[PDB]
Design a protein around this nucleic acid. Structure first.
Lengths: 79, 78, 204, 101
RNA sequence: UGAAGAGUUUGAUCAUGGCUCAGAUUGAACGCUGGCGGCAGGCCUAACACAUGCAAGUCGAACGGUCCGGAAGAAGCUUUCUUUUGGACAGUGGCGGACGGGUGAGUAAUGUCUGGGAAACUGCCUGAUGGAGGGGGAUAACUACUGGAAACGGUAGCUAAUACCGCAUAACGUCGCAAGACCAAAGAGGUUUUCUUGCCAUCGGAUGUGCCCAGAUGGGAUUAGCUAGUAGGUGGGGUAACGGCUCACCUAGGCGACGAUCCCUAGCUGGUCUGAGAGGAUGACCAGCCACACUGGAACUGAGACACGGUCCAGACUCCUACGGGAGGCAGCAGUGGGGAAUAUUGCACAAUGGGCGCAAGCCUGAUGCAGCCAUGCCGCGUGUAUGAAGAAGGCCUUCGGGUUGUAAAGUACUUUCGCGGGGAGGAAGGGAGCGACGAGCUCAUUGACGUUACCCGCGAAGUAGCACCGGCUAACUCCGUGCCAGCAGCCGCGGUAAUACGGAGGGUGCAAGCGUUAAUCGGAAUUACUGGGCGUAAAGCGCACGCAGGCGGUUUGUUAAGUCAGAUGUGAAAUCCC
């Protein structure tokens, strides 16, 4: 699965957290609601930095919290 | 073990068995895999006593599906 | 059904309903003309709701049916197209037990209802033991071959001879059979009922 | 009724008499009952005469007495120690009174 | 094709607002009233305590004895005794008990519901490939002896297997490097040189599962900051397998108003009922899943139970006891007692269907198939049905003229109950035997209800009946008695000499054992209103400014297109809702 998000942190090594956001309708009201999720993607080449909106795909669970890996960087920077 | 027996729709004054191929574990009148025909002991409802549909069962036969003693008789009658 | 004194309902309704010996001068309505009870002599004071109520009453009493189905058939007849009043009698007149009565197989609807339940009546070959059965046109209603011997029907059909039948029907005393030509209109039926008063009541 | 049960037993604490409200005046028979529910409420005693003592133990039905503010329950005569009314020709279905031969 | 509420706050009116009434359902009942017949159904209160019986065995084509039965011998007869053989019990050996059946306490959690993913497994069964050479060892039964009241136990001696172990062949498989080395396996039975049953290793199929993931899953914040393996990394340990799951070291984070944590409640779901729909309530019968069997905890053996008739430990109870010491626990079936308003035969039986084991014969199977008790409910008949005199009696009502009940209120016949006699169903045929290789197939016979009900035929007597209510809502009237007196009442009220609402009587309505009554669930309420609403005076705008998050936001172009929309496909748990 390909997910789009932002790099809200690049503190850890080879591990970058991507804040993916989506828009879904309320099961009752129906009005759109904003919901995000943090995913620890792998980045061995430490290429992606904070503010980078990259793509995320499902890969072999590098760890318990990391089951995704960096694919391609959409833009350059948007802190 | 996938077996091919009869599914009794049995009702007060209404005996009808459904020769179906299902797992041996499942109940006699539980969820079946696929029906191959029917059986009417009295053959009163319709003139067509049974409809084995050879080609159908001919598939399960060899796939690992075993037929009971009673059903085998009806099946053999084709 | 009500199951009880029918010779009292006639007077109560003011009109002489045909329950049984309505022909003989024995019918209480012929001897004394007034509702049952002690207050049958006193001058009654009916109101609007009164005329409508007592109206459908005699209507349902004639066919001798429950208030439930009688109300159900009303909703149906009122649903389909055409004048409700007309359709009303149509459905009620379509009842198997009722048809049998019109055919002459039974002395009355009460006895007819019994004949039906006793499987002593067939419809288009197959037997029907449900009085609430809706008889459609072109359907033949004859007596059971095994019931062709019972003295009761043997005397009923015997009197049926020379007796005329409704335009919406046609029986054959010989074969003891019968046919339901079509649905009877209000013109054919000569009942002491005001289809316009029975409808207003259910309006409320 | 607490458990929302149709009926509930209870041991009477005292079988005293009470007087109706403003619009009435009499000696209505009542009795405090300690239902198994854990509550001690007062119930009215229907009939022209009863035989309830201190250790009566009678089943409670549930009915408010417009005359006695508080009595929201009625006693079921014909059950337990509560002997049904005697010579009750009319209300036998209530008060519990077998039809005389 | 789908939508009509009413009563009560005023002296009167409108508005607001709460309560209340008839509806459907519930593994019930009490109060008083009983005939019958089909079908269906039965402790919803103490997981309270339990007498008694039952709830898994089956194999001699595994092996020695005993019990039961048959046949043939040594004998003139008897005693005694020998051989062969059938069944089975005791023992030894094999398989099974984690399937089925019961209950719902506990449980908010991927436990469940819905769709996916993979770091997996799967006895028996099915398809395909290959193989089964030689050898060695052990413990019971049995025999002898001893201890104990018993349970049961100690010692000595003999002995076999599809019981255990060592070596080869390698179809293969495993491991390092990279493109090398290592590691398997028991027969038996016969129509015995031909098959049958079974085994060893590998791949696949079938089927059943372990684990992970997105979304969804009640009430309260008068429950808010919480957390130390607690969050992440490396290595290791551990498991069938991922994972701090566990350990060492390092880093120091992780989670929270999209409300964690804590507390309360409840098996869940599909569904059930209700409603126009939405939605609400519920989830009892049946089907799936989960959890639990004296209370609590834990582990082993195994494909699978952490396992009711398996085991270990802690605690209480009951029973047995020469008190030394043992035997159990029906929230399994029936049943008992207690409790309660209250819910049944400690009955009959296996042929059918289905299930376990066996090649088969055959055995086991209160799973189940039926009957009994109770109208608890529904269907064709509670107090009757049909017939019947211009109607002389009795009960009922009455303006006292009359009218009504009109088998007569008598009888008679009945739908035709009940009861008696006969026949006796399956809405299912085999097991066995004959033909055929006791295989397929064909043929035939026995056995009927469940160790006799239903239904059919015949005979046949009319063969009980009561309660509630009658002011209004509630359908159904006056006289008499009493007299704010006694009493009635859900609400509005009624009764002080004419009371239809008090007690009685005549009459009438309802029920037609149901109807009333009591209790419980849903909507009407557009009174939280998303569809359906309001805030000057009726309940209701923050005192103001400003400002964070959030919501909303002018115009033009391009890329992406995540949301959104469309086609196809997979699943759409099953069941149901809807038709």
């Amino acid at each position: 699965r390909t997910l789009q998000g932002r790099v809200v942190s690049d503190k850890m090594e080879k591990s970058i957290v991507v804040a993916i956001e989506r828009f879904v309708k309320h099961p009752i009201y129906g009005k759109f609601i904003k919901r995000t999720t943090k995913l620890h993607v792998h980045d061995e080449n430490n290429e992606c930095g904070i503010g980078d909106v990259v793509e995320i795909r499902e890969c072999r669970p590098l760890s318990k919290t990391k089951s995704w890996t960096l694919v391609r960087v959409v833009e350059k920077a948007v802190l | 073990m996938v077996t091919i027996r009869l599914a009794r729709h049995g009702a007060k004054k209404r005996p009808f068995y459904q020769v179906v191929v299902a797992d041996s574990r499942n109940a006699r009148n539980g969820r079946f895999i696929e029906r191959v025909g029917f059986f009417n002991p009295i053959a009163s409802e319709k003139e067509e006593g049974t409809r084995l549909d050879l080609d159908r069962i001919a598939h399960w036969v060899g796939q690992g599906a075993t037929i009971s003693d009673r059903v085998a008789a009806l099946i053999k009658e084709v | 059904r009500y199951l009880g004194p029918k010779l009292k309902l006639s007077r109560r309704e003011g009109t002489d309903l045909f329950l049984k010996s309505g022909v003989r001068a024995i019918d209480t309505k012929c001897k004394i003309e007034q509702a049952p009870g002690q207050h049958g002599a006193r001058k009654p004071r009916l109101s609007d709701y009164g005329v409508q109520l007592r109206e459908k009453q005699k209507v349902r009493r004639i066919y001798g049916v429950l208030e439930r189905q009688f109300r159900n058939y009303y909703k149906e007849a009122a649903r389909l197209k055409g004048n409700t009043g007309e359709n009303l009698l149509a459905l009620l007149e379509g009842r198997l037990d009722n048809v049998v009565y019109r055919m002459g197989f039974g002395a009355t609807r009460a006895e007819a209802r019994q004949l039906v339940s006793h499987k002593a009546i067939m419809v288009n070959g197959r037997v029907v033991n449900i009085a609430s059965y809706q008889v459609s046109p072109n359907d033949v209603v004859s007596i059971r071959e095994k019931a062709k011997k019972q003295s009761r029907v043997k005397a009923a059909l015997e009197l049926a001879e020379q007796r005329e039948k409704p335009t919406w029907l046609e029986v054959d005393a010989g074969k003891m059979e019968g046919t339901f030509k079509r649905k009877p209109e209000r013109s054919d039926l000569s009942a002491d009922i005001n289809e316009h008063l029975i409808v207003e009541l259910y309006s409320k | 009724a607490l458990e929302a049960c149709p009926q509930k037993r209870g041991v009477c604490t005292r079988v005293y008499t009470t007087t109706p409200k403003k619009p009435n005046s009499a000696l209505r028979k009542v009795c405090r009952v300690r239902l198994t529910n854990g509550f001690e409420v007062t119930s009215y005693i229907g009939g022209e005469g009863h035989n309830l003592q201190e250790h009566s133990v009678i089943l409670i039905r549930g009915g408010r007495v417009k005359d006695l503010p508080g009595v929201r329950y009625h006693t079921v005569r014909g059950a337990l120690d509560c002997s049904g009314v005697k010579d009750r020709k009319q209300a036998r279905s209530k008060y519990g009174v077998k039809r005389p031969k």
